[PDB]
C-alpha cells in the first residue's frame, strides 16, 4: 500500500517483484477508459487468487470499482501439509473460469520464476474450463512446449536443476469458441529450491546456430495438419539448416463442464533453435486462429519466418524470455551479471521492467558495447524462508 503503481502494463511482473522484495504496493487506474468492462480482467483476478493461494500472510484488496488494488506481500510458502494442502506431496488445485483469454504460459512464467525462492516445493495443478495450453493470439503468449524447452533451460543455466523441475500436461487445449475456452489440465512440481541464484555471464558470441528441434501439436484435427506443417517448416528451413527435427503430437479433444461439451480444437507449432555455444535458444510459435480455419502450410511458413526473425535479431536471449532472465539476474547475489542482448531485442516491456526495478530498490543496469552488453547489479535477497539444515 506504500509503493505506488499505475496502469495495467506488466501487471504480473509488478505483483511478482512486489512479492519477491516484500515491498507493499498499490496499483491504481487499471482500465480507466474502457467503460464497457472496467477494472480487472478475469485472468488477472485468477492470477491474484493463485498468488494468494501459494503465498501466506498476503493481504490483497480489490476496490469497489476494481480499477485499483493494493497488495501487502507475505512469504512464498509453497505446498506445506499444514497450511496449503493435506500432504507434503499433494498438488494444490487451481481452477480458472471459462471467461479466460490469456494463456496458461502467461499464468505460468510468473509462477515459475517465483517458484525457486519458496519454502517447500511447488505442486500447482491448473484445471478448470479456461486453461488454454497452446499459443494464444491475444498478445501472443507462448505454448506449453515453447515455455518448457525455451525458458526452463535458463533456470538450468542459473543452477535450478532441470532434473528436478517437473512440468507435465495431461490434456491439451487450444482457444476454442472465441477467445474464451480451454480445458487442458497441467501440473507443475518444482522440487528444486535455491538459496541464492548464481550470477551468470552470457557474453561469448552464440554464432553458429547448430540445430533446430520442435513440436507440432494438433488437438481435434487430423494428423495431416501436423504433417503438412512439418513439410512447410522443413521446406523453408532446409535452405539453411540440415538437422531440423519436429515431433508431432495429437490429442483427441478436451471436455468441459457447462453435461460436458468438447472444446478447444486447434493446431499449432513451436520451434526451438539451439546454438552450439551454450544454453542459447531462439524460440517461436504459431497457433491457428480459433475461428479462422487457415492453411497449415501457411502456419508452418509463418512460424518459420518468425523464428528466422528472432534468429537475425537476438543477442543471446529472445524477447519473450528477456524479462525472466533479467529478474532472476537481479534476484542473484550482490554482484554484477553480464548479459548480451541484441540491439533489436529491447522492448517497452523490458524498459518498464527496468523502471520497476529502479522503483522497488534493486540497483541499476550498466549498458555498454561488445549487440550490447547489459550488466545488472544484483541485490542478493534470495529466498526469505527456507528451513536451513
Amino acid at each position: 500500500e506504500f509503493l505506488r503503481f499505475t496502469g495495467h502494463r506488466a501487471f504480473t511482473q509488478r505483483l511478482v517483484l512486489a512479492t519477491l522484495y516484500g515491498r507493499p504496493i498499490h496499483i491504481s487506474k487499471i482500465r480507466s477508459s474502457s467503460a464497457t468492462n472496467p477494472g480487472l480482467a478475469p485472468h488477472e483476478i485468477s492470477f491474484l487468487r493463485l498468488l494468494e493461494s501459494v503465498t501466506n500472510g498476503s493481504i490483497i484488496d480489490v476496490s469497489y470499482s476494481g480499477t485499483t488494488i493494493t497488495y501487502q506481500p507475505g512469504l512464498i510458502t509453497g505446498t506445506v501439509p499444514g497450511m496449503n494442502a493435506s500432504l507434503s506431496s499433494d498438488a494444490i488445485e487451481h481452477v480458472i473460469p471459462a471467461t479466460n483469454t490469456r494463456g496458461i504460459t502467461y499464468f505460468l512464467i510468473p509462477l515459475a520464476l517465483l517458484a525457486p525462492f519458496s519454502k517447500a516445493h511447488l505442486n500447482v495443478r491448473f484445471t478448470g474450463p479456461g486453461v488454454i495450453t497452446s499459443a494464444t493470439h491475444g498478445a501472443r503468449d507462448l505454448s506449453i512446449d515453447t515455455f518448457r524447452t525455451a525458458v526452463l533451460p535458463l533456470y538450468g543455466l542459473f543452477g535450478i536443476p532441470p532434473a528436478r523441475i517437473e512440468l507435465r500436461v495431461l490434456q491439451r487445449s487450444c482457444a476454442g469458441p472465441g477467445g474464451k475456452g480451454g480445458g487442458g489440465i497441467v501440473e507443475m512440481r518444482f522440487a528444486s529450491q535455491v538459496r541464492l541464484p548464481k550470477t551468470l555471464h552470457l557474453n561469448r558470441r552464440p554464432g553458429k546456430v547448430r540445430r533446430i528441434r520442435g513440436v507440432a501439436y494438433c488437438t481435434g484435427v487430423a494428423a495431416s495438419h501436423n504433417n503438412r506443417m512439418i513439410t512447410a517448416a522443413r521446406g523453408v528451413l532446409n535452405q539453411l539448416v540440415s538437422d531440423v527435427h519436429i515431433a508431432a503430437q495429437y490429442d483427441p479433444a478436451p471436455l468441459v463442464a457447462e453435461q460436458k461439451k468438447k472444446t478447444g480444437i486447434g493446431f499449432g507449432l513451436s520451434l526451438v533453435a539451439e546454438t552450439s555455444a551454450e544454453g542459447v535458444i531462439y524460440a517461436a510459435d504459431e497457433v491457428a486462429p480459433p475461428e479462422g480455419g487457415v492453411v497449415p502450410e501457411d502456419i508452418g511458413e509463418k512460424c518459420a519466418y518468425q523464428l528466422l526473425d528472432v534468429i537475425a535479431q537476438g543477442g543471446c536471449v529472445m524477447a519473450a524470455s528477456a524479462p525472466t532472465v533479467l529478474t532472476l539476474m537481479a534476484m542473484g547475489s550482490e554482484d554484477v551479471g553480464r548479459l548480451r542482448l541484441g540491439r533489436r531485442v529491447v522492448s517497452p516491456e523490458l524498459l518498464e521492467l527496468a523502471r520497476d526495478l529502479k522503483a522497488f530498490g534493486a540497483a541499476s543496469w550498466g549498458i555498454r558495447d561488445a549487440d550490447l552488453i547489459v550488466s545488472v547489479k544484483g541485490t542478493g535477497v534470495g529466498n526469505v524462508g527456507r528451513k536451513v539444515a
Binding site: G39, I45, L48, R49, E52, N56, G57, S58, I59, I60, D61, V62, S63, Y64, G66, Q72, G74, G82, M83, N84, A85, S86
Partner: protein, 102 residues
C-alpha cells in the same frame, strides 16, 4: 408376480427381449418412447435406490412412491463436507485472504 417374471414381462412388452424377428417383421416394424420406458423400468426394478414406506399413507386424502434418495443425499452431503471441512483442515493455519468487494 416375482421380480424376475415381472421384469421379463415388461421387457417383452418393450420388445427388447422378444423372439428373433424376421426381415419381414423388421419391415413391418419400420412401417409402423423406449428410452423413457427403460429408465422407468430400471428405476422401478432397482427399488433400493430410494427409501419407501410399505403401509402407504396413514389416512387417505384425495386431491390433485419415492420418499428420499439416501445414496444421492449421502453423496451430496459428502461433497459439501469436502468443500467445507476438508478445506478448513487444509487451511488450518492460514493468515490473510483476498478481500473482494465488487
Amino acid at each position: 408376480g416375482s421380480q424376475l417374471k415381472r421384469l421379463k414381462a415388461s421387457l417383452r412388452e418393450q420388445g427388447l427381449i422378444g423372439p428373433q424377428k424376421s426381415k419381414k417383421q423388421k419391415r413391418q416394424n419400420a412401417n409402423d418412447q423406449k428410452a423413457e420406458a427403460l429408465k422407468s423400468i430400471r428405476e422401478q426394478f432397482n427399488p433400493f435406490q430410494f427409501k419407501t414406506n410399505a403401509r402407504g399413507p396413514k389416512f387417505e386424502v384425495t386431491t390433485n412412491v419415492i420418499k428420499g434418495r439416501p445414496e444421492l443425499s449421502r453423496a451430496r452431503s459428502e461433497e459439501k463436507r469436502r468443500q467445507t471441512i476438508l478445506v478448513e483442515m487444509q487451511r488450518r493455519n492460514k493468515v490473510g485472504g483476498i478481500i473482494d468487494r465488487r
